[PDB]
Amino acid sequence: MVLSEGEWQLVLHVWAKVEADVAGHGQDILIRLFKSHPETLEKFDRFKHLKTEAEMKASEDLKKHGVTVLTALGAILKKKGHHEAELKPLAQSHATKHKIPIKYNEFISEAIIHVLHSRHPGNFGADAQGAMNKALELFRKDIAAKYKELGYQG
Ligand code: HEM
Numbered sequence: 001m002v003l004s005e006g007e008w009q010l011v012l013h014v015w016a017k018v019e020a021d022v023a024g025h026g027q028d029i030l031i032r033l034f035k036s037h038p039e040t041l042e043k044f045d046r047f048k049h050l051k052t053e054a055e056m057k058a059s060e061d062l063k064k065h066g067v068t069v070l071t072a073l074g075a076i077l078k079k080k081g082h083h084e085a086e087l088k089p090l091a092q093s094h095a096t097k098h099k100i101p102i103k104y105n106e107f108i109s110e111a112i113i114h115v116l117h118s119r120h121p122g123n124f125g126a127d128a129q130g131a132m133n134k135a136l137e138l139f140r141k142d143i144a145a146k147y148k149e150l151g152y153q154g
Helices: 005-036 053-058 060-077 084-097 103-119 126-150
Strands: none
Touching: 005 053, 005 060, 005 103, 005 126, 060 084, 060 126, 084 126, 103 126
């Protein structure tokens, strides 16, 4: 798939707001993911022990990882489709080291959309959400194809 330039501008316009507070958005998104789909928490040996939302909110390590996640994702989106080089090491570690099934990428995509909708309603109308969804679908499709190449797929 290909996004038009107008769709990329909608994506990067709301991302510019996210970047005003990377740590806060990273926290909100990962907590959303873990609450909504507790099974994903099990993949993080680092965080598996966190029992409540309050414990998650107080973990500086979780907040650090959320910054890491959003920085990597932002670098990818800013490539506007030309993200082959950035995707390869990400696919390799998630497929081979962390053993993350493809389905869980849909779950974090959902959490990203939820959080932007909650924090940026004026910049995240129907069209901007449609564009962000397309951008994340593009990402998931490309990462899934890499998984298959690397010998995981799934
Ligand atoms: C938007 C999708 C995602 C991005 C951009 C992302 C990015 C990253 C980055 C940059 C790292 C650190 C370096 C590396 O190991 O590659 C990482 C580590 C990791 N990610 Fe992801 N990730 C994503 C989705 C997920 C999902 C869906 C899960 C699990 C449900 C996951 C599980 C992990 C784990 C277990 C680690 C290692 C944490 C540790 O240091 O112990 N990732 N991720």
